[PDB]
Design a protein around this ligand. Structure first.
Ligand code: HEM
Ligand code: HEM
Ligand SMILES: [F-]
Ligand SMILES: [F-]
Lengths: 174, 175
C-alpha cells in the first residue's frame, strides 16, 4: 500500500522528543506518533510516488550510498511536513527542476549526509492535505548534529524561498 | 476540489456512444457516464488534477495561446481514455521519461496540431491505487472527430506508447 498516516496522540511506535514550529501554523505537541501503512490531536497522510526531479545519474549516486529504513541503529527520527507556495506550483517543470537542483543543489547537498541519514518522501498536496509533502528522516544519535546542519543549509537555499509552512516533529523509537 | 469520479451506469450527463477496448482488460459497456467533482452502475474511475510533470515553460506558453476552454457549446462529443503505463516506465528517472515523452515522441508538439479543435483534461490516479494511471478527457465538435481519430493513431505509433499497457476509449455524447 503506498499510503501512510501519522497520528499524533497518546499511542504509537515513536515517542515525541520535541516539536519545532519553524514556519506557519504549528502542530500540537503530543506524546507519541502512530504510523499506519494505510488510510489523537492530528493526522497527516501522504503517498509514496514516482520520481519528479532526480535524473538517472543522481539516482545512481543515491542508490550507491543511501541506507535503508529500519536500521537497528536508527533510533531517532524527524517528521517534517512541508508546504510550498502557489507560485512554486504554477511554475513549469524546467523552472522547478532548475530551482531544485541547478540553484539549490538539493540532491548534491543531501548526498553529503548519506549514509548516516535515511529518508522517505511522501506527497500529499494531491490529497487535499494542508501540507504538500511529509518528509521522514531517521538516523543514529551520532548524526543529530549533522542533520541539524543540513536543515539550516536547506533553509538557506533558493528552493526554500517557496516554502510557506514547515514543522519538525522529533521522535525516538520505542 | 481536485478529485473527479466517472461512474459508468444507467445515469449521467453523457451518453455512451461506444467503448473500444484497445489494450488489456476492457471496461463494461454501459448506457451513460455520470461525472462528479468529488470522491445500477458497473464501474467507477477516479483521478485528481495535479501539477505539471513534463511541460517546459515555452510549451506551456504555446498551449496557453491556443488551448480551448472546457464546456464550449459546440463540444458535444467527448472521449474518456483511461491509460496505464508499465512498471518499466515508472522506474525510469525524470530525465529518461521526459526524453521519451517529448524528445522522442513529441507528445506536446503533436497534440498542439489538434488545438483549438480538441479541449482536454488530464487526471492522475496511479497514486490513488487505481487500476489505471491516468484518466484523459477530450471534447470537441463533430467536425473534429476525424482529426481526433488521426491523433489517436499517431500517439499509438510513438515511443511513449511502447510503455502503455492498458487503454480503453469511452466515446460519449453530451445529453
Ligand atoms: C538527507 C538527505 C536528503 C537527500 C539525499 C534528499 C534527496 C532528495 C531527492 C533526490 C528528492 C527528489 C525526489 C524526486 O525526484 O521526486 C527530494 C525531494 C524532496 N526532499 Fe529531499 N533530500 C534529503 C534531505 C531533505 C531534507 C532534510 C528535507 C526537509 C527539510 C527535504 C525535503 C524534500 C522535499 C520537500 C522534497 C520534494 C520536493 C518537490 O517535489 O518539490 N529533503 N529529496
Ligand atoms: C489533444 C491534444 C493533446 C495535447 C495538446 C496534449 C498535451 C499534453 C501535455 C502538455 C501533457 C504533459 C502534462 C504534464 O506536463 O504534466 C500531457 C500528458 C498526457 N497526455 Fe496528452 N495531449 C493531447 C492528447 C492526448 C491524447 C489523445 C492522449 C491519449 C490517447 C493523451 C494522453 C496523455 C497522458 C496519458 C498524459 C500523461 C503522461 C505522463 O504523465 O506520463 N494526450 N498531454
Ligand atoms: F527527501
Ligand atoms: F493530455
Amino acid at each position: 500500500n503506498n499510503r501512510y498516516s501519522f497520528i499524533g496522540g497518546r499511542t504509537g511506535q515513536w515517542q515525541v522528543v520535541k516539536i519545532r514550529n519553524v514556519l506557519g501554523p504549528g502542530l500540537q505537541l503530543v506524546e507519541k506518533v502512530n504510523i499506519l501503512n494505510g488510510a489523537s490531536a492530528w493526522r497527516l497522510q501522504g503517498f509514496a510516488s514516482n520520481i519528479r526531479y532526480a535524473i538517472r545519474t543522481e539516482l545512481e549516486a543515491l542508490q550507491a550510498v543511501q541506507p535503508m529504513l529500519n536500521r537497528a541503529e536508527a533510533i531517532l527520527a524527524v517528521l517534517i511536513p512541508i508546504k510550498k507556495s502557489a507560485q512554486w506550483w504554477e511554475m513549469a517543470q524546467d523552472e522547478r527542476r532548475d530551482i531544485f537542483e541547478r540553484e539549490s543543489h538539493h540532491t548534491a547537498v543531501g548526498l553529503e549526509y548519506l549514509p548516516g541519514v535515511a529518508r522517505r518522501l511522501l506527497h500529499c498536496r494531491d490529497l487535499g492535505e494542508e501540507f504538500d509533502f511529509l518528509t521522514w528522516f531517521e538516523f543514529a544519535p551520532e548524526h543529530s548534529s549533522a542533520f541539524n546542519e543540513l536543515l539550516l543549509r536547506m533553509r538557506a537555499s533558493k528552493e526554500w524561498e517557496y516554502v510557506e509552512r514547515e514543522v519538525e516533529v522529533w521522535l525516538k523509537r520505542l
